[PDB]
């Protein structure tokens, strides 16, 4: 709802992730809308909207997702849009698309910081106060919300000029629908 | 290891709210005086005093994490009560803000010093006092954040 506030919890260690990655069997229980996921090289974010768990292809590639019934093959894929999705895991909670069409958006980081962002285009939007690029790293696939708490898009890439981030490039909610055919 | 931005505090006579912003635990002069805060290494003297502003600050205690100042300029606030209820509020002037749902005066009492938060969860002011017409609180006064910054220097 409003106001937006977030908090972060860690569930798995380093040795744990590696072993799980291979075996492809994950038995931990699930909660929340955004999940912190990780591979071997990278570690980023994935967001549940409307029964589907979505993330960035520059992170997930073509991989399956470790569930308690073994590995689970992707439902949708769209390389050209940098998007991917699986069925949302048991115990997750889904978001609902925006309708207000409001232009004041809010980015959620992997540290559970809520950053104010002002819309420009359909894929772009500007930071209200600049941050170093290192800070925004690892938060790809995190949701951007309207003030009512609804999904507007997903953080894809950042605009920087000398190691300082100025704006953000994101995947809009319409491009989910698109990809589901 | 679970930490809070907002402290429920007490003296002998009254009982109110404190809110940690930018390394400082903040509150109102009309609840505090020039009192020290209690720590297990004994008493701790105030860092910033401002009679004109109804403002007081100590160094932030143990088991506290700070809020960040609002950046969005939004005028659609949300006040937090000492029972942790959320009241929607609409900003008029620099320190004025009108309730969206007017309330009995009993219900806002003891919740001074508490925060007024923008939609992003960021911080905008601290609740100074309630405006009442025949016992029914209709708007609120608050200390803006730009003050707690100019006070800091």
């Amino acid at each position: 709802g409003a106001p937006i506030t977030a908090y972060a919890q860690q569930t798995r260690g380093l040795l744990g992730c590696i072993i799980t990655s291979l075996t492809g069997r994950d038995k931990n229980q699930v909660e929340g809308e955004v999940q912190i996921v990780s591979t071997a090289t990278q570690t980023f974010l994935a967001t549940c909207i409307n029964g589907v768990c979505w993330t960035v292809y520059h992170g997930a590639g073509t991989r399956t997702i470790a569930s308690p019934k073994g590995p689970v093959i992707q439902m949708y894929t769209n390389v050209d849009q940098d998007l991917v999705g699986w069925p949302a895991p048991q115990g997750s909670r889904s978001l609902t698309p925006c309708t207000c069409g409001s232009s004041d958006l809010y980015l959620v980081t992997r540290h559970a910081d809520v950053i104010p962002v002002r819309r420009r285009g359909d894929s772009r939007g500007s930071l209200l106060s600049p941050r170093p690029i290192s800070y925004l790293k690892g938060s790809s696939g995190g949701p951007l919300l309207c003030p009512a708490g609804h999904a507007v898009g997903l953080f894809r890439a950042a605009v920087c000029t000398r190691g300082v981030a100025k704006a953000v490039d994101f995947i809009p909610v319409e491009n989910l629908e698109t990809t589901m055919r | 290891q679970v930490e809070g931005e907002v402290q429920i505090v007490s003296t002998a006579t009254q009982t109110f709210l404190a809110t940690c912003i930018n390394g400082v635990c903040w509150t109102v002069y009309h609840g505090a005086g020039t009192r020290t805060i209690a720590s297990p290494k004994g008493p701790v003297i105030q860092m910033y005093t401002n009679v004109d502003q109804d403002l007081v600050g100590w160094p932030a205690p143990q088991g506290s994490r700070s809020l960040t100042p609002c950046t969005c300029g939004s005028s659609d606030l949300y006040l937090v009560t000492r029972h942790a209820d959320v009241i929607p509020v609409r900003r008029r002037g620099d320190s004025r803000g009108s309730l969206l749902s007017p309330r009995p005066i009993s219900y806002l009492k003891g919740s001074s010093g508490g925060p007024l938060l923008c939609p992003a969860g960021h911080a905008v002011g601290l609740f100074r006092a309630a405006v009442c017409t025949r016992g029914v609180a209709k708007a609120v006064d608050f200390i803006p954040v730009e003050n707690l910054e100019t006070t800091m220097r």
Binding site: T5 | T11, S64
Partner: peptide
């Protein structure tokens, strides 16, 4: 006299 902390509130809703 001294001001005393008697309780805390977490805006994130986070549990222990």
């Amino acid at each position: 006299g001294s001001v005393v902390i008697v309780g805390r509130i977490v805006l994130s809703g986070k549990p222990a």
